[PDB]
Ligand binder design. Structure first.
Ligand SMILES: COCc1cccc(NC(=O)Nc2cc(C)on2)c1
Lengths: 177, 179
């Protein structure tokens, strides 16, 4: 039964940990966002094929450029994440995540994931960005980033609402089969 | 409320880390050192490279750090001092991190499916590689928990800043030690 190592990378502002928790519990954690998501595996069926999906978080390693790649070898698929309401996290896909992921894993597939989709229509978020001469990242911007980095898919999701979330990991699995 | 959730997570995750290391030592390690199974000549007597100092890391957590973290359960705002008291012990993560690339290449190039067979036999969800990343994960995680406590503990929170200092310095020092 095919085993899949999926590593989740990106800035602290993507909410990597919450993404994973929301995915694996089927719920935004709400009351308290845990800081720890331990390496995880579960069976999922995809296009009729059962698959053992492995998920590794990397939160905490954002400042340790030599430690991060300790997790990269033998990964089957990466999620390179950014928050749709942090332009700096989006830019770091280009500046930081893609280069190291590719350097260490040249032939491994990348899914480009925009998180925090629910905060992109939110007045308070939007106004906070307007005050810094910025806007949320929109759909064509992620598409153009995906293309620039060789990402097999660009996908947007919210862990709050679950919108697009299960699709993220479906598609990480389809990128390997 | 929030400082309590964080403290609870600290402790729960510490127990799981101790359990995880223990399982790694008693399954993947023990099968090499036992003399129960046939070792690939690629890795024979190379358990020091594979596992690095994970034994000594486990004994720190299992003999000292967990019991002391537990003593701070009702004192979340003081828990930074635990990291200061035991700062020297954390220097062993520096050694662990340095060895981790050599560990991983050895397992790839020379272990074949020794560890995979051992995983199936014991029915473990975690592969040897998943266990051996855990120390790297754990050591970069304490600083996230301390930062969380700082967002919700009062002026009596220099007993967190000093802890965090130490827990920012250890992973940076291990980071800076890498070839
Ligand atoms: C008015 O909105 C309040 C509010 C408060 C806290 C969280 C959210 N939304 C998310 O966290 N969305 C996420 C989180 C991750 C990770 O991905 N999508 C929204």
């Amino acid at each position: 039964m095919q085993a899949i190592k999926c590593v989740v990378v990106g800035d602290g502002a993507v909410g990597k940990t919450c993404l994973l928790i929301s995915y694996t519990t089927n719920a935004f954690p709400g009351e308290y966002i845990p800081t720890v998501f331990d390496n995880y595996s579960a069976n999922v069926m995809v296009d009729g094929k059962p698959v053992n999906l492995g998920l590794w978080d990397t939160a905490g390693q954002e400042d340790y450029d030599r430690l991060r790649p300790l997790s990269y070898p033998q990964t089957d698929v990466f999620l390179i994440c950014f928050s749709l309401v942090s332009p700096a996290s989006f830019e770091n896909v280009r500046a930081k995540w893609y280069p190291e992921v590719r350097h260490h894993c040249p032939n491994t597939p990348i899914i480009l994931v925009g998180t925090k989709l629910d905060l992109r229509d939110d007045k308070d978020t939007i106004e906070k960005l307007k005050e810094k001469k910025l806007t949320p990242i929109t759909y064509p911007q992620g598409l153009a980033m995906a293309k620039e980095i060789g990402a097999v898919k660009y996908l947007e999701c919210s862990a709050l609402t679950q919108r697009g979330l299960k699709t993220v990991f479906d598609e990480a699995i389809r990128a390997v089969l | 409320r929030k400082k309590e959730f964080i403290m609870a997570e600290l402790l729960q995750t510490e127990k799981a880390y101790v359990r995880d290391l223990h399982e790694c030592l008693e399954t993947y390690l023990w099968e090499m050192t036992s003399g129960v199974e046939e070792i690939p000549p690629g890795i024979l007597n190379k358990e020091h490279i594979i596992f690095g100092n994970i034994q000594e890391i486990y004994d720190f957590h299992n003999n000292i750090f967990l019991k002391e973290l537990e003593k701070y359960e009702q004192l979340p705002e003081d828990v930074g001092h635990c990291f200061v008291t035991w700062a020297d012990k954390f220097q062993m993560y520096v050694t662990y991190c340095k060895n981790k690339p050599d560990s991983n290449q050895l397992i790839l190039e020379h272990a074949g499916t020794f560890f995979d067979e051992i995983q199936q036999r014991h029915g473990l969800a975690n592969s040897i590689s998943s266990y051996l990343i855990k120390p790297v994960q754990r050591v970069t995680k304490y600083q996230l928990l301390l930062k969380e406590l700082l967002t919700c503990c009062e002026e009596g929170k220099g007993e967190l800043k000093d802890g965090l200092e130490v827990m920012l310095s250890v992973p940076k020092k291990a980071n800076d030690a890498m070839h």
